[PDB]
Every structure is written in structure tokens, then in C-alpha cells.
């Protein structure tokens, strides 16, 4: 969902 989507877009690195 959207709030989790947002933190992924902020923080995700492989």
C-alpha cells in the first residue's frame, strides 16, 4: 500500500 510504498521509494537499496 501507499505509506509503505513511500518509505521504499525513500530508503530502498539492494
Amino acid at each position, epitope marked *: 500500500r501507499d*505509506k*509503505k510504498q*513511500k*518509505v521504499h*521509494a525513500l*530508503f*530502498y537499496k539492494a
Partner: antibody
Amino acid sequence: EVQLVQSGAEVKKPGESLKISCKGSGYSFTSYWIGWVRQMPGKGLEWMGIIYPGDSDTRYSPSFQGQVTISADKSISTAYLQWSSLKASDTAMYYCARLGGRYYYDSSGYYYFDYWGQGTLVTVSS
Amino acid sequence: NFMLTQPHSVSESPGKTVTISCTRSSGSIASNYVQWYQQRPGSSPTTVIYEDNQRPSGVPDRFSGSIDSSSNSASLTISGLKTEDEADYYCQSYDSSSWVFGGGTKLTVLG
């Protein structure tokens, strides 16, 4: 034994440059974001910015953007906060922290500050 | 874009179930994740709640967190207040994915 260990207290005058450090041990330094937080004396926490040591991807709070430099030296497992010209207003306690959690583009993923450095006291005065 | 507002002080005796509110001034509080930090006097801060309601492993079970969309506020609740809970508490969320902090709340355990 995950450890974020910040450098010693600093006493400085306006105009001087300063670089403080935050060293991570007990884990893979390049796999977790390191955040920087300011606390002026008697005041609340402020976010300064954050850096991923793997690629030196760096984000800044608008309040601090261009006022301070955040860098990292993956070979040394160290993150840094840097000024070229300190102001007496920069007197604060500085905290680094690791954004831990589970780094998966997933419903299962999450991110939060799970370890903090002990803080570095910067005192700027004439 | 928005301020996060907390009560300056809240004070209760131990045993109590006590809440700290965190009100967003513009935009739905439900739009971005809310974190809570505890900072004891002269100590570094620690995270007691993340993603609105998640409790980190070492944080005591008495800590929980929720959202109240009708007050546009988030809440940290301590069920069975203890003396070691005396601290400043800060809520935080995200603007342009820039982290916004609440002003902080001084929580006194009337001992």
C-alpha cells in the same frame, strides 16, 4: 555488538572548519543508511540529512542543505558531518543513527533508527 | 509544509495508562508513517514506535502507538507507566520525504 561510535567533544570558534565522525562496527556499513540529527541546547531534535554509504547517495533537510556537508568513507566504515565556517549558532549535540530494519521492496520491509551514536558535543564560541 | 504539535508537558503517577498526542497541522496524519522517539535526560534518543504502530524488539510491551484520523493526530500510549519512562518524547513524519519532528513532550512520572 553493533556499534555506532561518535568522535569526541569539540570546542571551536566562529569561522573555523570542523569535521566530526561516526564509525559503525559489527555489521555491513554499506548496507544501511546513516542519519544525522541536531539537538541545540535545551531544544528538540532536528533532522539534518541522511546518507547511504554504499553509493554516497545523500539527502538533506531544506534547513541544512548547503549549510553542512554529509559524506562517508565506506573503506573505514565511517560517516561524517562537515562545516567550512562554523557559527556560534551551530552549538549543538549531534547524533548519528543507523536506519535498520528489513531492506526489501516488500510488504515485509520496514525502516527505522535502531542504533544511535552516543552524540558529539560541538560548542562554538569566540 | 506542516508542523507536528505535541503537548509541552504531560504528568501522571505510575500504573496509569497515559497518552501523548501528535497533531499534524496540514495534510492527513494518515498520509505518512509516524515514528516516536524517547530521549531520557542526558542520553541519546531511542526509537520506541515506528510506522504508526510497530514496536521495536527491545522496547517494553507497555509501549503502543495509534492514529486518530478525526483529530488528525498520532498517539503514543504507555499502558502501566513506570518511573524509567520519564523522558522527552518526539513524534516525527515526512514532508517532501524530509523528516519533520514534533516539538517534543516532557513526560513526568509523578513518583
